[PDB]
Design an enzyme around this catalytic site. Sequence first.
Site, PDB file in Angstrom:
ATOM      1  N   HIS B  18       1.565   1.821  -2.608  1.00  0.00           N
ATOM      2  CA  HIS B  18       2.598   2.712  -2.132  1.00  0.00           C
ATOM      3  C   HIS B  18       3.234   3.423  -3.321  1.00  0.00           C
ATOM      4  CE1 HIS B  18       2.733  -0.349   1.355  1.00  0.00           C
ATOM      5  NE2 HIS B  18       2.117   0.734   1.786  1.00  0.00           N
ATOM      6  N   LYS B  42       5.896  -4.044  15.459  1.00  0.00           N
ATOM      7  CA  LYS B  42       5.682  -5.399  14.986  1.00  0.00           C
ATOM      8  C   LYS B  42       6.948  -5.859  14.266  1.00  0.00           C
ATOM      9  CE  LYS B  42       2.518  -8.223  12.187  1.00  0.00           C
ATOM     10  NZ  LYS B  42       1.299  -8.233  11.346  1.00  0.00           N
ATOM     11  N   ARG B  91      -6.721   5.663   2.879  1.00  0.00           N
ATOM     12  CA  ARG B  91      -7.486   4.692   2.108  1.00  0.00           C
ATOM     13  C   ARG B  91      -8.839   4.411   2.762  1.00  0.00           C
ATOM     14  NH1 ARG B  91      -8.346  -0.259   2.376  1.00  0.00           N
ATOM     15  NH2 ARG B  91      -6.747  -0.660   3.950  1.00  0.00           N
ATOM     16  N   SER B 129      -0.365  -4.234   2.913  1.00  0.00           N
ATOM     17  CA  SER B 129       0.769  -5.133   3.094  1.00  0.00           C
ATOM     18  C   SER B 129       0.335  -6.389   3.871  1.00  0.00           C
ATOM     19  CB  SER B 129       1.936  -4.423   3.775  1.00  0.00           C
ATOM     20  OG  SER B 129       2.763  -3.709   2.854  1.00  0.00           O
TER      21      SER B 129
END
Lengths: 159, 159
Positions: B18, B42, B91, B129
């Site tokens: 990030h 979430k 990504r 993450s």
Amino acid sequence: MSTKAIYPGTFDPITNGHIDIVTRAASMFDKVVLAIAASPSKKPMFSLDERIALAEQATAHLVNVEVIGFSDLMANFARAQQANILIRGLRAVADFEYEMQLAHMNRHLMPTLESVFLMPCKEWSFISSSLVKEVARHQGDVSHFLPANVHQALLNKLK
Amino acid sequence: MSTKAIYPGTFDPITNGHIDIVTRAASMFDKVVLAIAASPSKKPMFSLDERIALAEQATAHLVNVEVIGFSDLMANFARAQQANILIRGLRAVADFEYEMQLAHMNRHLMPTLESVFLMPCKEWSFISSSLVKEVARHQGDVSHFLPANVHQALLNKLK
């Protein structure tokens, strides 16, 4: 602050998809060079000079865009032009892997050069510029996909 | 000559990946807001206030970057902040289709907002993450992937 980008490609020929990309690039960076690859491995339908001419006409309305041919690595040309940004269009998934590769190689060649990826308008999502040629070669209506000047030049090329 | 970008995400927690993205964004746009989603669907490991705190510390060396929580659609927040640019980290090839979808929706919601896609440094090309947390949950060495301040906070959360 003094952002300068190159947008390299064959542009054989330039399509409404390309125009869209370079237009949006020109709206967010101070200068944009539409860089036309001189000696592409594939034999292009149009010559370098022709490709430059058509691109110039199609982008004349963009103040901060300048068309230029180049023959070297896009990374070297960027260094010469003192560009810190490299524009790449992202149409489809298949191309993504290649684009990742190219960015990583370009990072290797010039670490201060930042590759930046833009997606096309939905309108131009499924045009190929090789599908456009192919359709045109076998007599189809490609008018919606090309600038008027480019369309004319293409019609002439197929006679 | 003026550019303001948002970089939205959950940032639970912020990773080196990030930081790399926002650093490169901050290098090419005048201002960059690192926008932290308040209520992700979430349940995040860190609260919004914690996620703001960690991100602040980890971007304090970037003059033109500001961390802000938001609870609306990223497209509305962009309108509020007068952002014309939306940063997305790109990504995986898996995520590409979703990202295409999102940009098309975000273009629907706010046509003046330009989605811009950046690829991570090779170093952070395989981290998330989620995979960092999972490794850390079952006691693994994740120090290489997180800012020191983030790493410490994560260790405390699992002990």
